[PDB]
Symmetry: D4
Subunit: 205 residues, 8 copies
Amino acid sequence: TEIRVHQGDLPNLDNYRIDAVAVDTETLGLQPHRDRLCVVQLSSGDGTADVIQIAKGQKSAPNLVRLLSDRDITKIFHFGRFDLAILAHTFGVMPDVVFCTKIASKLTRTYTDRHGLKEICGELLNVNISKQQQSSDWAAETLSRAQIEYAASDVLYLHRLKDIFEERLKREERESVAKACFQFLPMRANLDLLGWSEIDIFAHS
Amino acid sequence: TEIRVHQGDLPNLDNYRIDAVAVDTETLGLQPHRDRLCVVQLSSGDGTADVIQIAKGQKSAPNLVRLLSDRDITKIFHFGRFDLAILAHTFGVMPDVVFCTKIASKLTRTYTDRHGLKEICGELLNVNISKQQQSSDWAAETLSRAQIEYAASDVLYLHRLKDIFEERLKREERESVAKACFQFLPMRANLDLLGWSEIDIFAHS
Amino acid sequence: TEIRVHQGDLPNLDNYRIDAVAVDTETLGLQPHRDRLCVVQLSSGDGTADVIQIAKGQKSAPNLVRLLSDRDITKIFHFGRFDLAILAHTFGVMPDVVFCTKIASKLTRTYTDRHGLKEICGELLNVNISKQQQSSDWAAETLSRAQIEYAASDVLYLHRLKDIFEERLKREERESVAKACFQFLPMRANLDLLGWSEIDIFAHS
Amino acid sequence: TEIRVHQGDLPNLDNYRIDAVAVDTETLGLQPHRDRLCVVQLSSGDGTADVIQIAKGQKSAPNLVRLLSDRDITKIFHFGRFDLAILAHTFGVMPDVVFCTKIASKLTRTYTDRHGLKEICGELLNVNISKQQQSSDWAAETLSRAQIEYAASDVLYLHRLKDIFEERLKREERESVAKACFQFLPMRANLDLLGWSEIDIFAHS
Amino acid sequence: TEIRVHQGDLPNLDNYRIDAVAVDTETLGLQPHRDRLCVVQLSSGDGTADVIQIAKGQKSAPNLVRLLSDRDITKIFHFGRFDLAILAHTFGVMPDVVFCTKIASKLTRTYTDRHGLKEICGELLNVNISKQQQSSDWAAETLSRAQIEYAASDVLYLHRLKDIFEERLKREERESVAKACFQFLPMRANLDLLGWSEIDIFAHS
Amino acid sequence: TEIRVHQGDLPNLDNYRIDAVAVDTETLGLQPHRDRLCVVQLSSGDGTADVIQIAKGQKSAPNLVRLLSDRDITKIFHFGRFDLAILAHTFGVMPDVVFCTKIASKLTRTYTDRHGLKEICGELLNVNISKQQQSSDWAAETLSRAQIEYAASDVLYLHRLKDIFEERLKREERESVAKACFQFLPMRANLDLLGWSEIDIFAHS
Amino acid sequence: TEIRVHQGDLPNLDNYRIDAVAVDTETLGLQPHRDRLCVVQLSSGDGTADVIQIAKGQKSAPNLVRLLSDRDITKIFHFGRFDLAILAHTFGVMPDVVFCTKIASKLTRTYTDRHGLKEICGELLNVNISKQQQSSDWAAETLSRAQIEYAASDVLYLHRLKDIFEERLKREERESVAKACFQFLPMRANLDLLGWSEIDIFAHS
Amino acid sequence: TEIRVHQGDLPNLDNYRIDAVAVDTETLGLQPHRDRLCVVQLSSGDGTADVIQIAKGQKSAPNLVRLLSDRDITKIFHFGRFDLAILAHTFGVMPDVVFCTKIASKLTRTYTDRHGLKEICGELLNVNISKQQQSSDWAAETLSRAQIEYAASDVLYLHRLKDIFEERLKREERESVAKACFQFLPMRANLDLLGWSEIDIFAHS
């Protein structure tokens, strides 16, 4: 593998002249108002990944923000509801072209109730994701090798999942449903930032 | 007030050359695959209402459906998540320009947890709606006077609520939030028809 | 109203040469092995009722048992699951031609979740049943007038509900589903007596 | 083990001139209106199995349906409440002569609260069923070897279970209870198809 | 009615040379280690009552304790599990000849799930007890007249209830069960004082 | 009752040269980051009240904040945990000399589980506060007379409650407990503002 | 581990002229009215056991019942609440001199919440009991060797536990509490048989 | 290791002329009024520990208590809410300079929901603490070697955790929050002793 570790921002976009980029984040917790962004992960799908450490109080990441803002590049997330919220809270730019593998899983893997990334990777690809480092100090000044390898491991497979999920969505005739869900997902994240994170806004009660 | 009761369909659209129409339905229950549409209510906001009795097995209602599919007319519902589902299930056309007073309530009446139509009308307009007839035989060949008056009372006030809620949404600066939620609402109803009625598609679990 | 009160048994069957008889019971509680049968109520639907006081330890009631065993007469209950159980446990005869207004309500009154007899009588007939005496000492040697009037009131109206429910079951094309449920109801009662009263035998868990 | 895989239908019924056939299904999920039938597996009890792939949108399987309809042949299921529902929804024929190992287990294996197929096969036969493939993509164009072997594994042992459960029902004198439950099971499945899937129709609440 | 109010203790036992005495207490709450005894009420059953105010830090009440210790007098309580605990904690004497109307109700009023004193008095005697003052400041130096009348109302009817419950226990042949329960009740109270107040010591879990 | 309504701030502190001031607030909801402070209520205990309307986006109120910052004046709240949070969030000043009647009630009224202000006022003073207006649009440009009267009602009685609670805390010897709770209360409110509003920080789980 | 297996009853009590006997039962389930007693195991504490197979419908076991009735012999159970109930229901003799290791554990092992026999034997004696056979067909005409060894394992250690628990009860000064609980235990079992198996007779609700 | 085991008290404080001491206790359970203190574990942070057995009824341990009350020495606990309560209940002295690793975890390890000592030690130091002996008979006159090694293991690592948590609290800017929580912790423990152990005193309900 190749994992390029950076401080603050990508040096340039030379490796990202592509149609879709897999994106993930790591934070200090589940509450964007309390838990700061610590890591941003990117991959072009070529089997390598970039891991960008975000400093405390960092307000800008121009190359990263260009990627997040570019409407011609689909950002692939797993449970993007969270990542979109924390990214918008941190850098002030809300992505609007997204694909979420968790929503896709809920729309296609109807034969199971386990939609976590580990189960998806195990079932669809026979790839073992190790989650031991998921609960670790992502704010450490120097990330461990195990942390760096885990962070890259979270983004290395999202392209293959998107390909398979697009096949399943086409087969079961949910393409327009999925497209509408992804179109609404950024606004669901915005509602999370504004204070309705514990509320299903569409529920009767 | 004036309540016009019809069999099958509106006679014409002479009374509905307006910018927005309030819409409600009555059914045999909460499950569209089991519980047929029995009554459709409409109002232009002029203090009169149309109550349309729908026959068993009726597949077509051209004037009503013509109104429902006119993209230049906003359809106002209370808890449109249900009504959109049953309308699309019955006539095969899903409206795509809607306003829902319950979503608006959840976005503006943040000081209460009661978002039912009775509580909203009581608080916002000091109008008392009596719900006694809500659980009644809406499939009766001849509706009683009490049933007809309840059905009209369900649609007579939605225009005034839309006006007030639009004022509140602009005042608290959540207009674009409401717009995005309303834009997504028809697909949420479609998801209900397809089999996800008990699932919040954006939740982690 | 006319209420004929008897000790032990009917004097004869002169008043019960009919197609259907409404039957109900009162007991000391919900557990047939602990709570003894105290009252049996009967009515032909002609506005009169028979109330039969059962003695402690009484094992036989030949006229009552002849009615309960007579396959040519349908026995109408409300929540017959219990009444069938207590009747079979007391007299050793399980009726097998029955109609239950609770099953019929659950199959037809799909627009509400309140299926008790008080609510059914209120909604279908505008008749007010008072339940204050439901929890009383039914084993008293002398029943009070309020007790006797309530006991008769439990059976005076089951014919009118059966007639209406039969109309609704025909209307929604659920006649065979209800008929099969009524056919199975006695074995559900036997399962209750044998010890599965707290178990839904068809559930996954 | 020989497992014969067919497309669409059996070529003939030469292997099924028997008094009882074990039947199971696999689907895309628990909701018959959304999740199509994908595989049907049968066995005569001779240690071999037939695995029939059902195509998307397939409406007919004349040989299979003739087998399912033959009243001289008892159909053995595990949790037939589901299989009967999905079979009737897909091919339009409701089997009416059935034996269910889950009902039998609940009526005889009263010393445990675990009635899943894994526990029954483990306790009664010391046979290890591996369920890893239960949650898999059963709609795949080509089934995997693991999928095929699991699907066959779900019918290979049902005859021996039926024999033992029949022994237990005779020993504990519960034969007529079980018979009435099995006679009613197809109507429970029909009720399931009609929209009462979440309701125990006999419960007080 | 006649209510004699005393400070600290009875002046003498001239009114309590009787076979059975009704006893009740009031405290500052449900936790004997935190909530001190404030009032003790007594009655000979003649329609009059004694209300004894207990002082802060009071360790002795010789005449009252003489009454509580005399094994030839049955002490009648409602929910004696609590009163025994608070009395033993306060005066160091655990009564051992008791009758509890709550246990008697649970052993006899099997036709209801409402075993409060208000409901019992309403059903068995048609006497209306008003509980508004049940939750009040019982530590006041001078009790209000409404408080005193409530306190007397708690003891005025326990003799009549004991007579009726003894009739019911004889009628349903449960006297020896009740007797064993009453003998164990003081040890249940001791278990409460020792720290097992939240544990059913006889439960499986 | 004299109620002075002001915009933005008190005109001066001529009426608040006192040793304790009753304070309460009204907002658009329970979430300080989403629901803005709308009204501040004050009372000197002289039977008059001041109601201060806070504008949207208002960042300063020098006279009010000077009063809130003054360590020689105890601020009396009911459920100050919330009021302290919203006040500190709005004006940037956290009061540090406080008394909370709800904590005091939980430390003294151990005989009840109802600690709301309405319930407290009913029990201790026999004064009926009507809360119908508690859930209303507090951000309206012009408050109704009923709203203003309710708002004054939430501060008019806190002094009298404080006097009674101080007597009870002295009587039951819990003064130092209450003092320590009040000393931590501002930090509990800060913890709420920082993101632990749903976490009991001292619980084991 | 000498294990003597008998049909119907012990031949005599020649091996049981001792002061205390360990007793445990096996049944078809938890409900004495439905599930019959299948096996009774006894031990004198000398490291050997007797396993007595009870036939369906067996009403008499004179030597065994003689042992159960001998008031000079303490019967040791684990969770005797169940065993006493099923023994009394089956043979008509209610033991009245008992020791229960579960009550003793709840009164002594206050540092844990896991009181099952496996955990007690593991912690207190470092002896491993294997519970695999607990859920098995105890009504088999011939028990397997594994069943026999498990059944003996249930009684082989109860004497040592009784010795240690008696030491702990003396040490912690809880002997009279335990004695009262053991004295009450037979009536708790009788209450289970009479129909209160789901009711805590001493609870407020 | 160098675990020194003592009866009753430390011989002197010659080894404890230090700025911070790790403290941990072992009891018979979670309820200080019932379950006595059995062991106190101390460490200077030098990799050695002192394990002090406390005798039944012992009220004094002057050298240990002198250390506990020396305000120039911070006492480090894990979940001091419990330890402080049992120490104060046993010896009558409440420490007032404390650090709690559970509060520190809840304020810093926001990326996990597991705050037990085992999980903290595993994550922060990669040290495996085995908790098998946590639930054991701590009142034995002679503790086993396994008990002694576990007891020392609970205190051997608290200094290293305090050092890391102090680094995290400074880095994340939460020192004044933690300081206020630690200042309130002794009053939370006092509240536990007084009877509010099950009440979060700051909650709305």
